[PDB]
């Protein structure tokens, strides 16, 4: 097939925006195979993303996140997925979206526990946008009616607010309350 992204990546160098956006689109189309060459030429895509004057911030961040996913970074990839704004799709249920959501969930839970103990200091930025992705997953799970799972993720994140909202707007408040009571009595450790 294309057999090389050299042409497209070299073309992206040119200032012509229209060209730049179309090259970004085609790179997103063919990322799955040429992630290695794209990796080699990330630098320029980083410039394209960071210079917010260019009106493809979300697309640049998304493609960078996908590339770093293919590489295996999974951290700067995560930040780029976060910077993709809302351009990222969540209901596509692709492998890439699913795994990045998993990374978001675990990372966010980590900062949640961290702050959980921290009385007020540190109060990590919790990139409100990361909060946004976790909330979006919350509503998607609510739509799928996984009240158990919403409740438990809320517990892990310490998000008593989301936990209470899901339990209240659950399918059976008494059974949900009994399940939550059991989990609190047995599994919960932090006093």
């Amino acid at each position: 097939m294309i057999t090389s992204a050299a042409g497209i990546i070299s073309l992206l160098d040119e200032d012509e925006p229209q060209l730049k956006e179309f090259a970004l689109h085609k790179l997103n189309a063919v990322v799955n195979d040429f992630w290695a060459e794209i990796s080699e030429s990330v630098d320029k895509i980083e410039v394209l993303y960071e210079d917010e004057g260019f009106r493809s911030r979300q697309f640049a961040a998304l493609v960078a996140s996908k590339v770093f996913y293919h590489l295996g970074a999974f951290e700067e990839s995560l930040n780029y997925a976060l910077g993709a704004g809302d351009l990222f799709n969540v209901n596509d249920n692709s492998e890439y979206v699913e795994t990045i959501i998993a990374k978001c969930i675990d990372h966010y839970t980590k900062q949640c526990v961290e702050n959980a103990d921290l009385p007020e200091g540190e109060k990590k930025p919790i990139d409100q946008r990361l909060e946004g992705i976790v909330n979006k997953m919350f509503q998607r799970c609510l739509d799928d009616h996984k009240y158990k799972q919403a409740i438990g993720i809320a517990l892990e994140t310490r998000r008593l607010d989301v936990f209470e909202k899901t339990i209240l707007e659950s399918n059976d408040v008494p059974g949900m309350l009994a399940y939550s009571l059991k989990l609190c009595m047995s599994l919960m450790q932090n006093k």
Binding site: K148, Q149, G152, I153, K182, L183, L187
Partner: protein, 32 residues
Amino acid sequence: DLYSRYKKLQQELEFLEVQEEYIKDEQKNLKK
């Protein structure tokens, strides 16, 4: 349900690690 079993798995994996260190220490003491 799913998370009940997930956290049970957490508990038992941790406890199994504790078993590993138990047996290593006890093996040393038994050699002595």
